[PDB]
Amino acid sequence: GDEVITQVVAVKNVSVRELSPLLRQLIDNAGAGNVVHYDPANIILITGRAAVVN
Amino acid sequence: ITQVVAVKNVSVRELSPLLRQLIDNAGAGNVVHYDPANIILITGRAAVVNRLAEIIRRVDQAGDKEIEVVELNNASAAEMVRIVEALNKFVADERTNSILISGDPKVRERLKRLIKQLDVEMAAKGNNRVVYLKYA
Amino acid sequence: KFVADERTNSILISGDPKVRERLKRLIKQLDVEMAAKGNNRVVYLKYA
């Protein structure tokens, strides 16, 4: 559905800052309210609509 | 009310912009102050102080890292050391002959995996042999 | 990248499951042991 939830998922292989521009492309591709925050401890944060967060 | 909660894993100054986002997202009166002794201060409405403490604890609980101590009965610890050293943290003691670990409960999963991986002891090779001469 | 132990005499690997495919290939490739060459020989002198 359209709900706003945060999802925490990992990419171990290389630091996920590498995805900041294209992920903010999906933060741009649709409506905002999102965050995608890349923890240097290497996990992954999204917040926003479950579809675009997907 | 003010809430004092910890993030041990890395210094919480790292959260100042996004936490002030929740100091911006709603009304002010808040403080979030990051003590270099590594604890955490919020002050403000219990709801926004909560979501703040949830981001905060979301960098607390996130990256967990500590030490393990696990017996190495067979493969020399210092060897375990060396043979992990090539991998790119780790301790062991050869008083005990035990891998110690510093890092993740993912490091705890995979490095209990490598606790187990090189524990094995090679079968005797008959390196030396006593031969009974029949004639000579 | 690559490791091994000669306690165990075992290749350890760091890298891909493509590195796992090809480097199980090279796990297997140089496992072979050369046949004995009769490097030394005891010769029975008939006369001298």
Swiss-Prot record, chain A:
Stretches the record annotates as N1: 3-54
Protein origin, superkingdom: Bacteria
TM stretches of this protein: none
Subcellular location: Cell outer membrane
Coiled-coil boundaries: none
Record remark: domains: The N0, N1, N2 and N3 domains are periplasmic, while the secretin and S domains form a channel that is partially inserted in the outer membrane. The cap gate extends out on the extracellular side of the channel partially closing the channel. The secretin domain forms a double beta-barrel structure; the outer barrel has an outer diameter of about 110 Angstroms while the inner barrel forms the central gate with a small pore in the closed state.
Protein family according to the UniProt entry: Belongs to the bacterial secretin family. GSP D subfamily.
Function: Involved in a type II secretion system (T2SS, formerly general secretion pathway, GSP) for the export of proteins. Required for secretion of cholera toxin through the outer membrane. This subunit forms the outer membrane channel.
Assembly with partners or alone: Forms a cylindrical channel with 15 subunits; unlike E.coli no 16-subunit channels are seen. The closed pentadeacameric channels are 195 Angstroms long and 145 Angstroms in diameter. Each subunit turns in a clock-wise manner around the channel.
Protein name (record): Secretin GspD
Gene: epsD
Part of the intact protein present: 121 to 174 of 674
